[PDB]
Amino acid sequence: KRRVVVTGLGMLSPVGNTVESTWKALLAGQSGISLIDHFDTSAYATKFAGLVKDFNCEDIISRKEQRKMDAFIQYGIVAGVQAMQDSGLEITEENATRIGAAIGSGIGGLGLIEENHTSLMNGGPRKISPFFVPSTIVNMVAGHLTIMYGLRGPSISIATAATSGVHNIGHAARIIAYGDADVMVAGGAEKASTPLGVGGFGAARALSTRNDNPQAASRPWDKERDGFVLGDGAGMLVLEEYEHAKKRGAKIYAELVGFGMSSDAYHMTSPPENGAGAALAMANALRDAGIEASQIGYVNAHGTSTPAGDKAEAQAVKTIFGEAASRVLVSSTKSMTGHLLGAAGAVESIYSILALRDQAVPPTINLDNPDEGCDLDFVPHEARQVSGMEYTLCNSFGFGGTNGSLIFKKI
């Protein structure tokens, strides 16, 4: 029976351009939200987001190649390289066939779709770039990374909106456990802070419009919350069959033990008050891991900072945790990072893994005045020290009612 462990990490987030710098900022309660400057936000209801500061790929992606990729692909490649380098894995002719990728994105190449469509409108189809398609489509991060590293094993890309990162990580694990691969680079990348992303989610009345205090905007479970905050970035993990990791003397961050999925079957852009879908996904991950809810020490929530979304998950956590509900810690790191969409589940799985390593749990900042009837410990304001935490759980839910939960185990 094949076990799957995590042997490499890579990340670009609004609070840091490496895994460790991002994690340091999160334990310190730092916000990565700021005012947008790369487009004129005068007419936008929302004028801020969690941006990647000073992104740099000069040494990683050639200049001939950069021109062929939307920003989300560039972020995903940089984070994937970070992970592959961290793993220390050496690809060979013998290996290549057993190493793959499961990387996606919720929305993909908004920036270059806008650029190409602007060009088409202005000068006709003659002005569309030859790179239009391969520069925007969701699966292009997996495609570039396999080519860059010579990976010939399975490559897939799951695009399930905000659930993408968890699904891609979960299915990469399944692929290894099934026997179709020994190693997979898995995760998600997103750069939706563009006129269409900001204007589009704004049109749906889904974004916070607290322009006068961008850093207080994302405030999960707080009574004054008014929608999510968009965040850009990428998170990647190298997953690897257990015996293969040891035999090569790999450093092992944690083991991936459970993966659960469900569908709300309720509404396209809102969860049911019940949180029944969220509950079933967590229940499925627990059964997959062979453990009880009481063994979970910390839940990194989907917690996007929407009025109805936050309430549904708190109900689902109550439902699954029952007695232990008040004893498990729950926190939403989107209070600092914003919502990375298709990359959220990927960076958040990293947070869930590091919490195990460091026995430290990042806070839900801005939780000044929690919803009433809430009995849960949302780790408000300040990080929390924990003791013998052996399991963490990461939730990620998405438009379409699609849900996913991952369970990591220490060592």
Ligand X SMILES: C=C1C[C@@]23C=CC(=O)[C@@](C)(CCC(=O)Nc4c(O)ccc(C(=O)O)c4O)[C@H]2C[C@@H]1CC3
Find the binding residues for ligand X in span 377-406 (CB under 6 A). 397-399
Pick from ligand X, a copy of itself, none: which does 131 bind, CB < 5 to 8 A by kind? a copy of itself
Q: 210 touches which of a copy of itself, ligand X, none (CB within 5 to 8 A by kind)? A: none
334 is an interface residue for a copy of itself by CB under 8 A:
no
- Residue 270 interacts, among ligand X, a copy of itself, none and using kind-specific CB cut-offs from 5 to 8 Å, with ligand X
Query: Using the rule CB under 6 A, is 227 a contact of ligand X?
Result: yes
- Is residue 67 part of the contact set for a copy of itself (CB under 8 A)? no
Residue 52: DSSP 8-state: P
Q: Which does 121 bind (CB under 5 to 8 A by kind): a copy of itself, ligand X, none?
A: a copy of itself
DSSP per residue, 134-145: HHHSTTHHHHHH
Which residues share a beta bridge with 262? 403
Q: Which residue in 54, 59, 247, 265 binds a copy of itself (CB under 8 A)?
A: 265
CB 208 within 8 A of CB 305: yes
Binding partner at 397 among ligand X, a copy of itself, none, C-beta below 5 to 8 Å by kind:
ligand X
Which residues inside 90-129 make contact with a copy of itself, applying CB under 8 A? 96-97, 100-101, 104, 106-107, 113-114, 116-118, 120-121, 124-126, 128-129
In the block, tokens 């939730």 appear at 395
Residue 271 binding: pick among ligand X, a copy of itself, none (C-beta 5-8 Å cut-off by kind): ligand X
Helix (H/G/I), strand (E/B), else coil: 370? strand
Q: Is 228 in the site for ligand X (CB under 6 A)?
A: yes
Site for ligand X in 233-262 (CB under 6 A): none
- 289-348 residues in contact with ligand X (CB under 6 A) are 304, 306-309, 339
How open is the CA angle 339-345-347, to the nearest 5 degrees? 80
Q: Is 297 exposed, middle or buried (0-12, 13-18, 19+ CB in 10 A)?
A: buried
Of 100 and 231, CB closest to ligand X? 231
Q: Looking at 131-139, 215-223, 229-237, 367-375, which segment touches a copy of itself (CB under 8 A)?
A: 131-139
**What b/e readout covers 140-155, taking b as 16+ CB neighbours within 10 angstroms?**
bbbbbbbeebebebbb
| DSSP letter, residue 300 | E
Closest approach, Cβ 3 to a copy of itself, in A, equals 15
User: Alpha-carbon distance 229 to 107, whole Å?
Assistant: 16
Site string for a copy of itself, 140-159 (x = CB under 8 A): x-xxx-xx-xxxxxxxxxxx
| Full DSSP string of 10-26 | EEEBTTBSSHHHHHHHH
Query: What does 239 interact with, of a copy of itself, ligand X, none (CB < 5 to 8 A by kind)?
Result: none
155-156 sheet: strands from edge to edge: 155-156, 99-104, 183-190, 233-241, 4-12, 254-263, 402-409, 391-398, 298-300, 329-331
Amino acid found at 341: L
Residues 7, 13, 16, 17: what is their CA dihedral angle, to the nearest 10 degrees? 60
Least separation, in Å, of the C-beta of 205 and ligand X? 4
Question: Taking the complex as a whole, how short is the minimal distance between the CB of residue 400 and a copy of itself, in angstroms?
Answer: 2
Binding test (CB under 8 A) with a copy of itself, winner from 16, 187, 202, 220:
202
From the list 43-51, 290-298, 364-372, 381-389, the region that binds a copy of itself by CB under 8 A is 43-51
Smaller CB distance to a copy of itself: residue 171 or 191?
Answer: 171
Q: Select the binding partner of residue 266 from ligand X, a copy of itself, none (C-beta < 5 to 8 A, by kind).
A: a copy of itself
Which helix (DSSP H) or strand (DSSP E) does residue 172 occupy? Answer: helix 164-178
Residue range at the interface with ligand X (CB under 6 A); choices 71-79, 84-92, 266-274, 370-378: 266-274
Closest CA to 44 of 214, 232, 200: 200
Q: Cα separation of 137 and 104, whole Å?
A: 10
Among 66, 209, 211, 270, binds ligand X (CB under 6 A): 270
